[PDB]
Design an enzyme around this catalytic site. Sequence first.
Site, PDB file in Angstrom:
ATOM      1  N   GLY A   1       0.784  -1.234   0.000  1.00 48.59           N
ATOM      2  CA  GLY A   1       0.000   0.000   0.000  1.00 48.59           C
ATOM      3  C   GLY A   1       0.814   1.282   0.000  1.00 48.59           C
ATOM      4  N   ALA A  23       2.974   7.642   3.411  1.00 49.65           N
ATOM      5  CA  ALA A  23       3.671   8.915   3.284  1.00 49.65           C
ATOM      6  C   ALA A  23       5.087   8.699   2.759  1.00 49.65           C
ATOM      7  CB  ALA A  23       3.702   9.639   4.623  1.00 49.65           C
ATOM      8  N   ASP A  28       6.080   9.278  13.264  1.00 49.44           N
ATOM      9  CA  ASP A  28       4.694   8.941  12.952  1.00 49.44           C
ATOM     10  C   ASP A  28       4.407   7.447  13.081  1.00 49.44           C
ATOM     11  OD1 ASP A  28       2.051   9.247  12.215  1.00 49.44           O
ATOM     12  OD2 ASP A  28       2.473   9.266  10.061  1.00 49.44           O
ATOM     13  N   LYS A  40      11.873   0.193  -1.476  1.00 44.73           N
ATOM     14  CA  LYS A  40      11.391   1.542  -1.215  1.00 44.73           C
ATOM     15  C   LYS A  40      12.305   2.563  -1.883  1.00 44.73           C
ATOM     16  CE  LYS A  40       9.263   1.879   2.470  1.00 44.73           C
ATOM     17  NZ  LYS A  40       8.822   1.882   3.892  1.00 44.73           N
TER      18      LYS A  40
END
EC number: 2.7.11.22
Lengths: 228, 229, 291, 291
Positions: free
Chosen positions: C9, C12, C136, C31
């Site tokens: 998915g 950010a 986060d 990534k």
Amino acid sequence: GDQRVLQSLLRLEERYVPRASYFQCVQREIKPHMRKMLAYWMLEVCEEQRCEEEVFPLAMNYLDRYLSCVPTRKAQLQLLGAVCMLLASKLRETTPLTIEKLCIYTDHAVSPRQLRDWEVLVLGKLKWDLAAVIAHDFLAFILHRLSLPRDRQALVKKHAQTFLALCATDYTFAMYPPSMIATGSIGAAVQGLGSGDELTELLAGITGTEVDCLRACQEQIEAALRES
Amino acid sequence: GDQRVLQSLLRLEERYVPRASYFQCVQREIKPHMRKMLAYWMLEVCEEQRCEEEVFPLAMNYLDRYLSCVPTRKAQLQLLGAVCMLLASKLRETTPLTIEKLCIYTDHAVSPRQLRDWEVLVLGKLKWDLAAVIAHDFLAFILHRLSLPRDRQALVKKHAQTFLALCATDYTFAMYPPSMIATGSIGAAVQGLGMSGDELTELLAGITGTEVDCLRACQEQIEAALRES
Amino acid sequence: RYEPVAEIGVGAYGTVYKARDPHSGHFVALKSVRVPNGGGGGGGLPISTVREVALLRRLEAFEHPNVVRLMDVCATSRTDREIKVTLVFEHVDQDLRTYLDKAPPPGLPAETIKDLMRQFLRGLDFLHANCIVHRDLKPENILVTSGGTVKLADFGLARIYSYQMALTPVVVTLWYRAPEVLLQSTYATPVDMWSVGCIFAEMFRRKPLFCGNSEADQLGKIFDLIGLPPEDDWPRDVSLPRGAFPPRGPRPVQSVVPEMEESGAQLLLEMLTFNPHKRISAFRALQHSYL
Amino acid sequence: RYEPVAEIGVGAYGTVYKARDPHSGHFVALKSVRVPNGGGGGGGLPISTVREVALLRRLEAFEHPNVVRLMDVCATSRTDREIKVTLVFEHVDQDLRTYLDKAPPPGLPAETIKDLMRQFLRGLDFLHANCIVHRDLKPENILVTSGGTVKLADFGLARIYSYQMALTPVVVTLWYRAPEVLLQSTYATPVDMWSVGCIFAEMFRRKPLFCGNSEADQLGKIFDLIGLPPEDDWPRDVSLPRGAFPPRGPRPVQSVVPEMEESGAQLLLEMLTFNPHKRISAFRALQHSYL
């Protein structure tokens, strides 16, 4: 070429060698041990700020010259030290030390106001004659005049600089001519990095010093190192 | 406190110690003498730029690790050296070296274009693992654990760093654990600045957890390498 | 290098590819980020990027069981004005949301949630020990392996995504955000512990604790439970004032989140403390009576 | 601490006071400048000022017979922000203008001008050896002692006089200026040698060689004697183009300046060369057949 520069450098030394032993002028509160205690603090600061290797000894040059004619007090010693530091840096570094950086090193015992004033005070007492010749200013020249290649000069030069810093901390070398301190500590370095007579005569032949002096000098530095 | 930091530092060393002696991989054109000849040039540059004392050894760390798995050529040696220099500085200095400053040191034999590309090349080959533990990273800790005051630490620390630089230039210490190089060169320094030798070596060994035997042979080898450099 | 087969998915950090390592047979999470390759003062690399990437690789060495590992790093100069850096992370399919999503009626037993929270705080404390602040935390990036081990992910990627995000205006979940971040306070480590509280409560709820539309709305939901902070507890030099909210008092914790034990409620109070200075760390929370 | 009794003329450095040293009995030239005393990063002294002042003091050490000595330096914080620095120079009343002003009909014999030019180039070469470029030589600052010794003055004061504006520029003499300076191409050392030529000719004239109203006018007077430079000799990236002047050819040197010997004329040609690279230095001029 380089030969013209050496002659002139040698000539000047006499002018930037403290006039006398001043511990009879600052007899009230100054003491040789305090002068050395201050020296190590100046060394910490410069090694911390990664200052040019020349600054420290230069700063100590200013210190001695100032203490030679001006009887200063105990509490003002740290203040005086910072100023010399400042000046030395301002004269010999691309990006010299700010008065705030030195301000935090004095643990804020020395206000920025004091530093500005005393900078002018020290300059006047030294007649703004700060382009002094110090031992370090002899390295490059006397290294070129050797039987060594630039291929290995890196380590020799670095090791020689700790002896140079050593001298600046020890009052016994204060009155010594820069050339002798240089040629002497650079001999202590090369000999510790790989005879002695042929080496000392090569070094002496460069700076025009005597073989006798050089040896006693070189030996005294090596002795001062182990007992520091 | 400091005890928690030492344990971790020690742990990591194994990861940032060159895997093997690579002079059987770069057997075509590389030679131990060239590796040292390059080392002194890196030392000149760092001492010239007044880089943080840690950069040089770190750069040499990158060099060895890169030469361990990548067979590079003679002409590309100077180029490789600059990159390691660059990276080392970029990782451990407030104001690292620009690729132009290093460009002029290579006498313009290494174009700025080559430096950008090879920076990416070296990073990939080292898997971007550059936060390596080097001998120098042990100084402060093992100095605090001594019978000396900060009042005199200035000279000792400086003198110890020339031994540290010495090691980085001499291939014989390449495979040595950073801790041993540190505790060994810092012993060579303190002993040359004035406590007996045995009592000193046992104090140092007790800190880094090394053996007294090793430390001595190591300390002696460094002092021997200095006089014969 | 690696073979990509499926896709993870989007959060950010952009498209995260699921790939195969033709060697180990393990799956890896590819990534990618595009970096600076050339500058206006000669070709340079962003020091901050090479540092943070190297800082992550270093962690892998410690091999902590509660954090995702950065296995490898790839770089390709596709564009002439920049370079694409691929960070090869340790892949784990199941995350905390899907773990709670397949949770029976009575939820997770007291011991199962206890264990999950223990490993969750073990990895966090480890991160904080190495000077890394996960800015986060959320069930999306808190991965759980099939074995039951909790591995934190997407942590020290602050300066690596600043360039990208600035390029692409992003929208993110501010439910687990700490109050100081929301009021642009003086950031800190304890910012993580607030996120720990929001997720610890979601374990006994299976539905987020706070849900705010914007930043101002997020605070509104928060003050209505913990109560409006004191004058001495409110920070200085901020955009949002204390007077912008109606005076609220402390509410019963177990009333909002049922099935909480004696030491469970007393822990959440210290977890969801407004003042970061009074907010207990991961080390102290780990050695609590509840765990 | 010095006593001022009389005053020296005004040039591009302000009021120069003539004072007495109550110790030596020698006269000194007091020269004041107002410096920066406090900064926005803590009290500081402009590095460039402390350097150049220290650079001058250093020269005194060499004790060259052909340059004015900087005896002492005084500083007083009269203003709160800035500070007034007084440079105590070695004083000598007679300058080159007053020396030529009291010159008989046949001017100075060949040997007298020869000697004057020899000492003039000895001091200049010394200055250049120590990396100091006198940016504006002229009979006003070329002092001559009663003994007959030539001492140069007002030399390395570039960065010390940039911090003040008195209006001296309005009447700044650009007669002895070098072409490149008027053109602003590049500042070199050979800029001095051009001034040496203008003054060497004034020794056989007792009246300036070139006299220009403004900058453009100064070039006009110059090209009308030495001739318009070649395409390869004209610099790049300048404000004034070569086409802005009518093509002039080289003129007889001894016709413009009578009473010039064989080696005297051949020297001035090399002295007043347009190209600074082809212009011979003070060292080469000193070992010429004429001297």
